[PDB]
Amino acid sequence: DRPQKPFDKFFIDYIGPLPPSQGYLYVLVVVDGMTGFTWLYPTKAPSTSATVKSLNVLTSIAIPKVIHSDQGAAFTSSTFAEWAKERGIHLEFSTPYHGKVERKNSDIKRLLTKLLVGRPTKWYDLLPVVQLALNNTYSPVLKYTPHQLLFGIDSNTPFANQDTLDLTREEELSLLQEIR
Amino acid sequence: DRPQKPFDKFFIDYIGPLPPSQGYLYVLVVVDGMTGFTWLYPTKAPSTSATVKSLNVLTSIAIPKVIHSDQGAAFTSSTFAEWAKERGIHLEFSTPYHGKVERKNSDIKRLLTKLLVGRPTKWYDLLPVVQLALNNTYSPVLKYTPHQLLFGIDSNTPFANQDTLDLTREEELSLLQEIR
Amino acid sequence: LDAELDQLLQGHYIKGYPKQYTYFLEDGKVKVSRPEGVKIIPPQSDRQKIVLQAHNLAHTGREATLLKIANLYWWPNMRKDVVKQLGRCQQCLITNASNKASGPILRPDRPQKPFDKFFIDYIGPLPPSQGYLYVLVVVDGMTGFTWLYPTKAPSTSATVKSLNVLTSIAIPKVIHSDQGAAFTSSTFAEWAKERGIHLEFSTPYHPQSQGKVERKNSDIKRLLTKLLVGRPTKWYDLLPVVQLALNNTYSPVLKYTPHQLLFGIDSNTPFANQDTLDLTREEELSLLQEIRTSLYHPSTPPASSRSWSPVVGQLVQERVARPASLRPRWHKPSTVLKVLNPRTVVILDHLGNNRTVSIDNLKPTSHQ
Amino acid sequence: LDAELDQLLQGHYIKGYPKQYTYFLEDGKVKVSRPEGVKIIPPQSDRQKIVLQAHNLAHTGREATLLKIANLYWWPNMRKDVVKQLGRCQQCLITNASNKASGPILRPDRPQKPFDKFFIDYIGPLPPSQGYLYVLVVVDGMTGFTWLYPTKAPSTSATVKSLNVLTSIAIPKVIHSDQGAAFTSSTFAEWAKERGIHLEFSTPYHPQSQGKVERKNSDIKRLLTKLLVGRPTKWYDLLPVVQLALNNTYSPVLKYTPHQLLFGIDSNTPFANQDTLDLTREEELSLLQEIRTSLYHPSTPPASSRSWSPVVGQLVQERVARPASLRPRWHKPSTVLKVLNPRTVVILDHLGNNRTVSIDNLKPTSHQ
DNA sequence: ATTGTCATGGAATTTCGCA
DNA sequence: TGCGAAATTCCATGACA
DNA sequence: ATTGTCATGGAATTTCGCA
DNA sequence: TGCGAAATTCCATGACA
Numbered sequence A, B: 001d002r003p004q005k006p007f008d009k010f011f012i013d014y015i016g017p018l019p020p021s022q023g024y025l026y027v028l029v030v031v032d033g034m035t036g037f038t039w040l041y042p043t044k045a046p047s048t049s050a051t052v053k054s055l056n057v058l059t060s061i062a063i064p065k066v067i068h069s070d071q072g073a074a075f076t077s078s079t080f081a082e083w084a085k086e087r088g089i090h091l092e093f094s095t096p097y098h099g100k101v102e103r104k105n106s107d108i109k110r111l112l113t114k115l116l117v118g119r120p121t122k123w124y125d126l127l128p129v130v131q132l133a134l135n136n137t138y139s140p141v142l143k144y145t146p147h148q149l150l151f152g153i154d155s156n157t158p159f160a161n162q163d164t165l166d167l168t169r170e171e172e173l174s175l176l177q178e179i180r
Numbered sequence C, D: 001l002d003a004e005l006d007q008l009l010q011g012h013y014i015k016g017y018p019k020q021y022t023y024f025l026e027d028g029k030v031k032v033s034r035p036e037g038v039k040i041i042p043p044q045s046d047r048q049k050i051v052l053q054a055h056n057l058a059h060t061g062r063e064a065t066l067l068k069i070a071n072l073y074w075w076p077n078m079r080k081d082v083v084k085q086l087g088r089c090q091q092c093l094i095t096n097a098s099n100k101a102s103g104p105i106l107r108p109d110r111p112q113k114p115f116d117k118f119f120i121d122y123i124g125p126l127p128p129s130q131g132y133l134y135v136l137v138v139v140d141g142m143t144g145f146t147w148l149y150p151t152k153a154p155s156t157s158a159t160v161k162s163l164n165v166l167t168s169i170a171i172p173k174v175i176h177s178d179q180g181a182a183f184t185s186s187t188f189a190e191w192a193k194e195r196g197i198h199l200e201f202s203t204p205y206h207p208q209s210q211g212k213v214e215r216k217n218s219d220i221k222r223l224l225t226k227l228l229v230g231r232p233t234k235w236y237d238l239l240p241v242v243q244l245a246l247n248n249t250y251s252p253v254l255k256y257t258p259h260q261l262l263f264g265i266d267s268n269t270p271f272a273n274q275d276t277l278d279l280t281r282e283e284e285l286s287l288l289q290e291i292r293t294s295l296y297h298p299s300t301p302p303a304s305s306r307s308w309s310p311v312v313g314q315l316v317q318e319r320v321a322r323p324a325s326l327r328p329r330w331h332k333p334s335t336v337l338k339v340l341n342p343r344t345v346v347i348l349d350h351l352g353n354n355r356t357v358s359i360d361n362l363k364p365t366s367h368q
Numbered sequence E, G: 001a002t003t004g005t006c007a008t009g010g011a012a013t014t015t016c017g018c019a
Numbered sequence F, H: 001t002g003c004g005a006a007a008t009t010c011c012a013t014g015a016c017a
């Protein structure tokens, strides 16, 4: 067996609906398995079409050997399958209804949730800093950040301020207000 | 004493009024003394102004040391004198009321007169061929044509057909008709 | 094909496949253990499609194509198959740049006499002056003596008006021009024939061929520029001044002014030369003929190390003259019919017309 | 003056006037019998006006001026007086061409790491596609890896939108550009500062300084051209294709694709390289660091035989950037303050501002 | 069927003036 | 028959849409 | 205050395959 | 230990408004 590598497997998934930001409602999350690198793309819908536009941008930078998703409608569509086949990408689905990637995905949700309070509407502008944070975050399991693993160098934006990521009593109270 | 040279003396004079050709009535005749070369310029008037426009063209090609004319109004004007002085040309007038040049001038009149019958109105167009004829005409006194003397070479248009230059009985009769 | 790779697997020798490596079967594909690693030997009838796929990724040339292919495959003489494709890629052949220089320029003999050859050309559009926009520039080949005429348009009609005035002085044997509309019109051709003047044209889009007049245009603009510094650009009134100034300026290499070469004596202009004041005109004209034959003549320079030379029957490509955005800079290949001289050729274009053309507007089609 | 020429006439010796010739008076003018003929010796206080009159005929340089003067006059050291005037003719100094080449180009060190330096530049306008007219091109200096963004305008606003997307991946230390309006706006400068990116600008009108990106623009247009042959020029949809194609193309001199230099491993693209399939990522990243430090570096070429080099305090002239018709191609003289390196200088212009400038846009003012 | 050219000013080389 | 300096010649550089 | 670059295909040079 | 031919390297040429 060969050691795991960048571009071996991209894990994709949707987050939303979110409070509309610049007419966008979802975030397509793309995470490289081996490095834990994250790419985020805002969409208007979890449709095959929006997935296809967004991945088209990413795969003009790097192409994964395999994409892995749950059985979301967008990903199980025959259009998406033709798309992947064109590009020589094998598609992989987890079975319906059931740690590196999973911890990453959890951080993304938790980090968004933290920043879309007091400003549930300005997230579109924040996506680039969200990614830089995610990608320059120390990995407990491996010595390195994802940036380090993907490029083989130190980054120019190190996030030394590993934050709380937890909601304070103010944020807690007025996140309960936003849905009341 | 130095041998005579091109540009030593230009002999200038007017011919006209002529039958209007393209709104022109006169011909300014310029003849180099030494070579017998001829330059012709059509004017609307024997005025200092038309003389000045025309010579301005010629003296942008060569400048004579001396211009010689009769005491025509155009040539004795103080404007024309200022013009000549600017250019460092000495002006020379024959006295009022009285052979190389003279024979040349005579040919010009005789040659025009010959060609402005049957077509007293198309002379403007003819000026260039008139000059080529004059300038590539054998000189009895010297071995050479004026072209030869001015440029030191044979010309590409030799006028082997030295013509009659005299009026036939037809031309004679219908030159008498034109002024009747 | 699959025939040849059967022989190879059992241990036979085939020409081109070095016997000293281990050739095996794996996943239904023939492989070989090469110093760089294991590579697949595709069947011969597969090889074209592989080279094409590699080339088409970015339309790469020989080595960039080879390096992709060599990532997965080995066979005998890969670059031969690489080159064979590159020479058949229409897009590559008409888009890529040349990388071979033309041969060294010719230096034609100076015309022997004033009026043997005139070179003529337009300058402009310049800024409007007295409602004129262009200059007609006429340069006698032997002397350098130059006539200047302002025009509103680089038109035959204006050219004819102008030359009618100049030819009053003398008729030239030949007039040489570039292929601008004014000079190639039949109205012009008639005018020339009327007077037994022969028209000679440059190869298209090659102003060097008219080098004498083109080089005079530079001096004309240079003097006009100096004279106009800090004033509005009203040049019309200055044309005659420039004409006279230049015709009476010395060429340091020749030690003569165009005027001197034309007339053999200065006219009444500043700093006129007095050296022949005591000779007769006849003696002066005699010394002039001597000066005219003994002028400096430059010799053709050394060839660059990677110049090419046209051979009859060779595939060559004309440079596109006014390439639009994102369009190839070279026409389709064509064939050298005649080699008029080492810098000029006649080509049959594919259409197929005969085109007389400058080697500088050709490149030799790569990969035969 | 008239004092000195009195001494000379009676037969004394004066410095510079060779004693061995016969100096006489005639028409109230001092003359001398020179091998070429009799020439007038103007008084010293006459000599300037004479040189000026000669020069002004056609604004001629040294020898063409001298040859006119020598037609009538002789004095001692004429060319010294000739040169003295030429160096004071404002029109000549700002119109004439240079005839000295710049020193040989520098080859700066490759940036050491991806994201150390970005070079960026606009291409266009191209023909409209999907209502876009330009490309923003970003090229990482170490890898050659390139990002392409279509824009409707070469504007800051579009540049900021584009870099906001790219900087999602990584923030670069420095971004290098030319002085186009989009990159020199303060809106841009703020954007850069916000993120601790340092802006670096080329000397004006010197695209060589950005050679990496400029050279990528060529490949971008070349591939777009090949792909569009015989179709309408709808390029917008092809931009991502071109991006991926180029980033995965081998440089034959380097033997690596920009992608390889950036990632150390090919992604799932045709003919991907398999050589590190058995190394761990850690081993792969280690070998990548080795490759990155040992890439070919070109060395500065030999100097041309007539190059010049800027010295502090020297008079030099900036090239005019967009000279109008019949206007000089050079600005007024100015002074070299600092020599940043043999190809870049700071000049004090006469106004007098400090201008950082490329030696290629300078000529050294002639005749001191 | 046609084809580079030549002003320019430092540097290199030759000539001059004098002995 | 040789020196220093002035004159002349050499020639790369660049621009003619 | 900043700085040329590099794909390309014949030609030149080195290496390979075999003895 | 040297041959012929294939591979690889060299590098001038040209184009990036």
Ligand SMILES: CCN1C[C@H](C)n2c(c(O)c3c(=O)n(Cc4ccc(F)c(Cl)c4)nc(C(=O)NC)c32)C1=O
Binding pocket: C121, C122, C178, C179, C180, C181, C204, C205, C206, C207, C208, C209, C210, C211, C214, C215, F016, F017
């Ligand atoms: C339309 C017919 N026509 C064709 C082309 C347009 N053309 C015409 C011209 O007069 C010139 C011209 O003067 N120069 C300037 C130039 C450049 C380099 C040199 F070496 C030299 Cl001796 C001169 N260039 C071109 C040209 O070919 N540009 C691409 C040109 C012409 O009239």
Ligand SMILES: CCN1C[C@H](C)n2c(c(O)c3c(=O)n(Cc4ccc(F)c(Cl)c4)nc(C(=O)NC)c32)C1=O
Binding pocket: D121, D122, D178, D179, D180, D181, D204, D205, D206, D207, D208, D209, D210, D211, D214, D215, H016, H017
């Ligand atoms: C307005 C700010 N601005 C200034 C100038 C206009 N500029 C800008 C560019 O991007 C380029 C450009 O790409 N090229 C092409 C070129 C030519 C020769 C070379 F060696 C390389 Cl490396 C590139 N030329 C110019 C230019 O200076 N033309 C005279 C240019 C720019 O944006």
Ligand SMILES: [Mg+2]
Binding pocket: A013, A014, A070, A072
């Ligand atoms: Mg999901």
Ligand SMILES: [Mg+2]
Binding pocket: B013, B014, B070, B072
């Ligand atoms: Mg009279």
Ligand SMILES: [Mg+2]
Binding pocket: C121, C122, C178, C180
């Ligand atoms: Mg033309």
Ligand SMILES: [Mg+2]
Binding pocket: C121, C122, C207, C214, C217
């Ligand atoms: Mg032209």
Ligand SMILES: [Mg+2]
Binding pocket: D121, D122, D178, D180
């Ligand atoms: Mg630019």
Ligand SMILES: [Mg+2]
Binding pocket: D121, D122, D207, D214, D217
């Ligand atoms: Mg550019």
Ligand SMILES: [N+]
Binding pocket: C108, C109
């Ligand atoms: N010739």
Ligand SMILES: [N+]
Binding pocket: D108, D109
């Ligand atoms: N450097």
Ligand SMILES: [Zn+2]
Binding pocket: C055, C059, C060, C089, C090, C091, C092, D226
């Ligand atoms: Zn191709």
Ligand SMILES: [Zn+2]
Binding pocket: C226, D055, D059, D060, D089, D090, D091, D092
């Ligand atoms: Zn001047």
